[PDB]
Amino acid sequence: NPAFDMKQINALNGHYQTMIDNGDLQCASYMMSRGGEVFAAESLGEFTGGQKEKQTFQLDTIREIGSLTKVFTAVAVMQLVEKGLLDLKMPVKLILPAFDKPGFGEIKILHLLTHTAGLSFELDIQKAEGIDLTNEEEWINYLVSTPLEYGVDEAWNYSRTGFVILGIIISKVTGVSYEQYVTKHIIEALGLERTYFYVPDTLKEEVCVISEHECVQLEKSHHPYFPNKATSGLYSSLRDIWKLAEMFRNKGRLKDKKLLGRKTVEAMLRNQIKPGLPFYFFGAPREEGGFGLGINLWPAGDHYFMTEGTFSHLGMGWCGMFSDPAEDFTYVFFTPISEFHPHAVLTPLNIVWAGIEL
Numbered sequence: 102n103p104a105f106d107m108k109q110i111n112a113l114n115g116h117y118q119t120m121i122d123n124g125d126l127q128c129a130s131y132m133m134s135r136g137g138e139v140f141a142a143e144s145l146g147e148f149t150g151g152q153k154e155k156q157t158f159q160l161d162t163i164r165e166i167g168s169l170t171k172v173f174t175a176v177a178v179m180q181l182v183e184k185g186l187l188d189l190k191m192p193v194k195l196i197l198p199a200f201d202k203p204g205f206g207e208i209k210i211l212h213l214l215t216h217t218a219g220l221s222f223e224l225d226i227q228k229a230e231g232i233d234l235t236n237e238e239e240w241i242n243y244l245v246s247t248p249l250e251y252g253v254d255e256a257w258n259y260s261r262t263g264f265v266i267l268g269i270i271i272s273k274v275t276g277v278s279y280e281q282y283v284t285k286h287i288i289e290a291l292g293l294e295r296t297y298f299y300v301p302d303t304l305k306e307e308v309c310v311i312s313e314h315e316c317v318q319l320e321k322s323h324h325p326y327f328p329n330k331a332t333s334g335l336y337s338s339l340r341d342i343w344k345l346a347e348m349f350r351n352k353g354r355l356k357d358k359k360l361l362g363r364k365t366v367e368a369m370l371r372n373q374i375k376p377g378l379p380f381y382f383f384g385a386p387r388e389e390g391g392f393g394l395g396i397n398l399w400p401a402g403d404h405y406f407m408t409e410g411t412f413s414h415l416g417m418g419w420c421g422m423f424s425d426p427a428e429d430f431t432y433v434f435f436t437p438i439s440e441f442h443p444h445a446v447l448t449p450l451n452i453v454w455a456g457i458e459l
């Protein structure tokens with residue numbers, strides 16, 4: 102009944118296992134659904150951070166989702182737009198008065214959500230001597246102390262600092278910390294069971310780590326150099342990331358649970374980048390593609406097997422969530438690996454979508 106060629110599930114498992122057997126990556130897991138029903142899910146390999154014997158990789162293993170945290174930040178922003186507390190055309194200076202200066206005074210909330218605010222990829226912690234970057238106002242005043250790379254609406258430039266600002270805006274608008282809002286109005290509201298900004302001590306043994314750095318960050322109470330965890334730092338599982346993708350595919354609903362109105366989701370999944378604008382990723386020119394309100398619309402169509410309209414987001418880790426609304430199809434995966442490799446992160450997407458039938 103899922104209308105999927107299970108011959109491609111065999112290829113997907115052998116593809117991941119072949120890289121595991123060759124030592125390219127330690128573990129891998131995935132979960133795919135059609136019509137809201139999961140029909141295939143597998144966890145492969147073993148993990149260790151360097152201080153442990155290799156433990157099994159399971160489907161409920163907690164793993165940092167990295168850049169996928171931005172998707173949680175995008176939902177939280179739009180919830181406040183639905184409540185009328187925020188507006189996408191609001192200048193950031195109205196909420197953060199430190200932005201009332203040339204260059205920064207032109208930035209609107211819409212520019213941050215779509216990576217068009219002209220911000221660089223990341224702020225520099227080495228040049229921030231004597232400044233507590235974990236403090237909200239000290240981080241903002243040091244941010245506006247650093248020049249902007251481009252003007253607003255000049256180019257698409259992936260920026261970590263953009264979503265850090267949004268997390269601050271959520272905090273100043275709601276009156277609670279960013280992590281408190283997301284945990285209450287998204288994590289607990291969507292019924293996510295294995296998702297935490299900071300994993301409790303009784304569950305840290307079930308968190309997948311693959312490097313010394315990840316073990317150290319797992320035992321910490323803050324982000325190393327950001328006032329919040331809006332751009333990165335969330336820990337989750339396959340099913341919880343799957344629930345988030347399915348909520349988007351159903352336009353804000355997940356059975357009895359509702360996070361966004363359907364008209365809001367249709368706007369988030371809508372291309373928001375003006376045509377002909379250049380795209381940059383980490384100091385390199387990237388191919389022009391659709392981008393919504395924090396949600397990626399590329400890759401889709403073209404030489405890929407994902408139908409046009411497939412929305413997505415990847416995360417450093419690596420991980421990823423892909424959902425094809427035209428096929429009622431969702432695919433999420435964890436591939437913990439030191440450096441990015443398209444053969445492990447992107448290539449399996451060809452194997453998966455090749456299995457869809459009728």
Ligand SMILES: C[C@@H]1CCC/C=C/C=C\[C@H](O)C[C@@H](O)C/C=C/C=C/[C@@H](O)C/C=C/C=C\C(=O)O1
Pocket residue numbers: 168259382383387415416417441
């Ligand atoms: C499909 C692409 C992925 C290709 C980019 C990765 C290249 C690998 C190594 C490079 O040195 C850069 C890398 O280390 C730095 C990664 C920073 C954060 C990445 C995540 O936020 C995923 C973002 C995906 C967005 C667009 C895209 O287009 O993702």
